[PDB]
Structure 1
Amino acid sequence: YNDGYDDDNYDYIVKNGEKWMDRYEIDSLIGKGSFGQVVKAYDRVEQEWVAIKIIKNKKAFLNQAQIEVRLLELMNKHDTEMKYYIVHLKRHFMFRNHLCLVFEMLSYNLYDLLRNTNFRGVSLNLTRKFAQQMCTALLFLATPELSIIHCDLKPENILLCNPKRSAIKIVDFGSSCQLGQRIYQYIQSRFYRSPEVLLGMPYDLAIDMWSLGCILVEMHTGEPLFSGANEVDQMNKIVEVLGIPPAHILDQAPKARKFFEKLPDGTWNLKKEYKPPGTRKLHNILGVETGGPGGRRAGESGHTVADYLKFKDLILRMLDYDPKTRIQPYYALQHSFFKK
């Protein structure tokens, strides 16, 4: 395989200590994905640490990574400080028949941060810092020239700049596209997957705001909001919290009847275990009136009933079933939850 450089997965066989083009010293493997691998490397020439994404030696992944490079370079062009919430691609090159994207070195992902809380969550004040940054990132992505749908927002794809600060960036535009082909695909990681995608409808940038709402509840509670074992379980768990989707959505949805039944009067209900629809209130999940998630924020700074009510209002607006009326990033940033 590839003069002995590749395994039977078309991944490059990483050897710690290896030196590339008399410039990069491979330190270690920090990441694996469907695209290939991510390694920590010291760039001798610029005297800095870098994350090198080594794409599999297979034309499908190489072609996809060429779109990824194009989108990252498109974002890099922009003369705005909002692009500093997106991972910086420094350059790319072909090496031993692998396309390599050289990124800035970031730190732990938000999933590592949740594991460090022992899955009990971070303060509302830290959740607020992360929410403000992520809404600015999505405001940037929805710049008309860009119109980029990330398509895979989740804690694992949000990384701290460094382990000491609250500063974060979005990584992994490997699954990303520009708005244009209004088509259905099976996309987003299941826990963070929007009702429109579950329902087989075409998607737009609002799917990233759905994911963000799920992420921010999980950051504070310590656990995924909607942890489906499959699509039916995923939709059932969404309906536990938010109730039955609007009829005008289900009437247009190719996969409506995978989860719902149309009754003789044209109203819809869940198909033939689960809490009844709308019984698992976000009010109760967040512990608005009971000192936060499992009561653990009882008498803490900036954890008032009014603080929780603002958070709950913002999340409910991000978890709108209707992608047309789902809150857009600018209006999220104007939300009273951010007024301190």
Structure 2
Amino acid sequence: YNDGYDDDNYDYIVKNGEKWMDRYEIDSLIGKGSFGQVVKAYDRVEQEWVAIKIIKNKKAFLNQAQIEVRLLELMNKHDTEMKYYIVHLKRHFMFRNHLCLVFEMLSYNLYDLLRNTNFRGVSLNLTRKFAQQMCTALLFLATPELSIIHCDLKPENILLCNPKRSAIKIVDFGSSCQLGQRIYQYIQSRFYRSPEVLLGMPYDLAIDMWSLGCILVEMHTGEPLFSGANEVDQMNKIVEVLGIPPAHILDQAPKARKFFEKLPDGTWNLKKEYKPPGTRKLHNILGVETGGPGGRRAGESGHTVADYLKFKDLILRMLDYDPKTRIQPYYALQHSFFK
């Protein structure tokens, strides 16, 4: 293990108080993920805490992180005032056989926020703040010179900047790509995976908007909207809410028959118990008329029927099966939900 320094998962074994390169004092592990670890460090030179993503000493992670660095640096050539809600990569270096990405220090991810609500959700008002930021972030990523598809939006990859404000940033561009790259497939985290990707179809930046629609519902209900145990269960759970996808899409989907078959009348239906297609209404998931998710927002300011109907509309537009008509970031931002 790399001159001593690695565990059996090819992680750097953090030693609290270690100094690196006469510059960073490692304080502690913040958290682990697939890619490796994020540690809290003090940068003596800039005099600030930084979150150092220490990539596993494994080629696949190293290579993914090099793609991440490239995309972050590209995003940086634009967002120098850090306006657009993407985590700032300060610098990167190889250290003891681990690629290290030095980020600004942020705070809890939105999953952990949901965990602190006991998976019962945050307010629609907070949901709206997250939504507005996330739509602005997507707006940014879709700037032509970037055209970046995050490809793994989920609550864990959206972080509070700090524990007392509603400001957030997107993290983790390990799985990201630019438009026209199509080599990736079975991409996105399953709960947040777009129909086009489930269907093995060409995809674009609209996949991120699908993920966001899923995320926003979850932020408010506390629970994943579409919590499939596998792709088939995923598509089924999607269909429960949204109905059979448009025929014009299914006729074009290489993986149509993973999920669907044509009936003798030439129409598409599921292969296989679930609520029948389109019968699990978002109207009811959100509790539009019944005091919000599980009735728990009954009375609360900012949780009116009118508010929920606006939120539902926005969400349904994000969860358009058709990536061509799925609401784009700009128009999402103009939605009545945000007035």
TM superposition score normalised by structure 1: 0.97
Q: In 2, Cα distance between the equivalents of 1:319 and 1:79?
A: 28
Q: 1:80: Cα distance to partner?
A: 6.7
- Shift in CA distance, 183/247, structure 1 to aligned 2, threshold 3 Å: farther
Aligned to 1:273: 273
SS in structure 2 at match of 1:101: strand
Contiguous gaps of at least 5 residues in structure 1: none
Cα deviation digits, residues 271-291 of structure 1 (max 9, x gap):
132111111100111111111
Q: 1:9: Cα distance to partner?
A: 2.4
Aligned to 1:68: 68
Q: In 2, Cα distance between the equivalents of 1:8 and 1:272?
A: 41
Q: In 2, Cα distance between the equivalents of 1:233 and 1:145?
A: 37
Q: 1:204: Cα distance to partner?
A: 0.8
Comparing 4-13 and 304-313, the one that deviates more: 4-13
SS in structure 2 at match of 1:46: coil
Is contact 1:183-1:203 (8 Å) kept?
no
Cα deviation digits, residues 14-71 of structure 1 (max 9, x gap):
1112111121111111122222211111111222111001112233322221221111
Q: In 2, Cα distance between the equivalents of 1:34 and 1:114?
A: 21
Is contact 1:183-1:202 (8 Å) kept?
no
Q: In 1, Cα distance between the equivalents of 2:7 and 2:283?
A: 50
Comparing 31-40 and 134-143, the one that deviates more: 31-40
Q: 1:184: Cα distance to partner?
A: 5.2
Is contact 1:245-1:321 (8 Å) kept?
yes
Is contact 1:183-1:201 (8 Å) kept?
no
Q: 1:297: Cα distance to partner?
A: 1.1
Is contact 2:259-2:271 (8 Å) kept?
yes
SS in structure 2 at match of 1:252: coil
Is contact 1:184-1:203 (8 Å) kept?
no
Comparing 1-10 and 199-208, the one that deviates more: 1-10
Is contact 1:247-1:268 (8 Å) kept?
yes
Cα deviation digits, residues 210-242 of structure 1 (max 9, x gap):
000000001111111111111111111111100
Q: 1:315: Cα distance to partner?
A: 0.2
Q: In 1, Cα distance between the equivalents of 2:329 and 2:120?
A: 27
Q: 1:146: Cα distance to partner?
A: 0.1
Q: In 1, Cα distance between the equivalents of 2:65 and 2:335?
A: 36
- Shift in CA distance, 79/234, structure 1 to aligned 2, threshold 3 Å: closer
Aligned to 2:228: 228
Q: 1:79: Cα distance to partner?
A: 5.1
- Shift in CA distance, 17/155, structure 1 to aligned 2, threshold 3 Å: same
Is contact 1:184-1:197 (8 Å) kept?
no
SS in structure 1 at match of 2:83: helix
Cα deviation digits, residues 129-161 of structure 1 (max 9, x gap):
100000000000000000000000000000000
Q: In 2, Cα distance between the equivalents of 1:265 and 1:297?
A: 44
- Shift in CA distance, 259/49, structure 1 to aligned 2, threshold 3 Å: same
SS in structure 2 at match of 1:53: strand
Q: In 1, Cα distance between the equivalents of 2:310 and 2:79?
A: 33
Is contact 1:142-1:148 (8 Å) kept?
yes
Is contact 1:121-1:220 (8 Å) kept?
yes
- Shift in CA distance, 80/309, structure 1 to aligned 2, threshold 3 Å: farther
Q: In 1, Cα distance between the equivalents of 2:196 and 2:128?
A: 27
Q: 1:183: Cα distance to partner?
A: 4.1
Q: In 1, Cα distance between the equivalents of 2:289 and 2:62?
A: 52
- Shift in CA distance, 257/184, structure 1 to aligned 2, threshold 3 Å: farther
Aligned-residue RMSD, C-alpha:
1.3
Is contact 2:226-2:238 (8 Å) kept?
yes
Q: In 2, Cα distance between the equivalents of 1:159 and 1:272?
A: 37
- Shift in CA distance, 127/262, structure 1 to aligned 2, threshold 3 Å: same
